[PDB]
Structure formats: structure tokens, C-alpha cells
Amino acid sequence: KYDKNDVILEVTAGRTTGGDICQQFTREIFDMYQNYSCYKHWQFELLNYTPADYGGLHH
RNA sequence: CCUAUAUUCAAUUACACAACCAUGCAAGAAGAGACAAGUCGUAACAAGGUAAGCAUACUGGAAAGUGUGCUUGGAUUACC
Ligand SMILES: [K+]
Ligand SMILES: [K+]
Ligand SMILES: [Mg+2]
Ligand SMILES: [Mg+2]
Ligand SMILES: [Mg+2]
Ligand SMILES: [Mg+2]
Ligand SMILES: [Mg+2]
Ligand SMILES: [Mg+2]
Ligand SMILES: [Mg+2]
Ligand SMILES: [Mg+2]
Ligand SMILES: [Mg+2]
Ligand SMILES: [Mg+2]
Ligand SMILES: [Mg+2]
């Protein structure tokens, strides 16, 4: 079923450790899927992008 | 009633009678604790950058802010 509906991918910053170790890691995997979409010839549409203070992605 | 002995007895009345408390459930309200790292600010510990704090009053998103009196669980480094 489905497989022909646009899918929204949401990434956040896990709350398990202090610092930016989790926030910085969020940026890397977010760009992983963005480059992956080009490999699969998909279409990427940015909806929300909130950078963190210490060079990261809050959500 | 010349030895002797037989028989009966009841429940009513005036008024109170779920107030009351226990247990269980509930439309819903409020508090406390928890890890965790999110948003907002930096109150406290150094004269914490306005010395802190108690009683009480008033005020503000939030720590708290300010007045009056009191405490040193602050200092004035000591022929200055
Ligand atoms: K103060
Ligand atoms: K002090
Ligand atoms: Mg922290
Ligand atoms: Mg000073
Ligand atoms: Mg301070
Ligand atoms: Mg200040
Ligand atoms: Mg102060
Ligand atoms: Mg004071
Ligand atoms: Mg007071
Ligand atoms: Mg004032
Ligand atoms: Mg005062
Ligand atoms: Mg004034
Ligand atoms: Mg001395």
C-alpha cells in the first residue's frame, strides 16, 4: 500500500547527552539523505531548517 | 378444703427509624516527585560582579525586585 505518496522526513536532536555531540551528528545524517535522494533521482523539498548555536541542527 | 389439690395472666405505650461514618466510583481542579541535556533568562557560591539572609508588605514571564527593623551563617587586609 501507499508507495505513491509524498513522504515528509523529520530529523531532531536527541536528548541523552550534553554538548553538541548529538546536535552536530544530526547535520551529518540529514545531508546523507539529501545526497541519497539525488542518487535515487528523487525530489528534495526543504520545509523547515533550524540551525543550532554550536554549528548543528536542532530540528 | 373426711387423705389432698385445681386454675389464670399480656405485651403495649410516647417518639425516633440514614442523620451519620466507612469503603468503592466520578464530571473535574490543584500540588509533589522523576529522568533529560529542549525553549527563555542568570537568581546563588569569589565584595557572583546590586554582601547574603529572616519576619512582613507590595510588585513581575520566571528566577526574583524593592521598603521597614533585625542577624553575620560577609569584608573593611588591623603602629591605616
Ligand atoms: K542579590
Ligand atoms: K557573600
Ligand atoms: Mg547542561
Ligand atoms: Mg565588587
Ligand atoms: Mg549572579
Ligand atoms: Mg548585574
Ligand atoms: Mg547578588
Ligand atoms: Mg539585600
Ligand atoms: Mg522576605
Ligand atoms: Mg520595583
Ligand atoms: Mg531588603
Ligand atoms: Mg525605585
Ligand atoms: Mg587580616
Q: How far is the CA of A11 from the C1' of B58 (A)?
A: 48
Residue reference for cell 515528509: A8
Q: How far is the CA of A24 from the C1' of B5 (A)?
A: 124
Q: Solving technique for this entry?
A: cryo-EM
**Nucleic strand B within 7 A of Cβ A58:** yes
* Contact predicate A51/A31, CB 8 Å: no
Which ranges of chain A does DSSP label H, i.e. alpha helix? Answer: 21-39
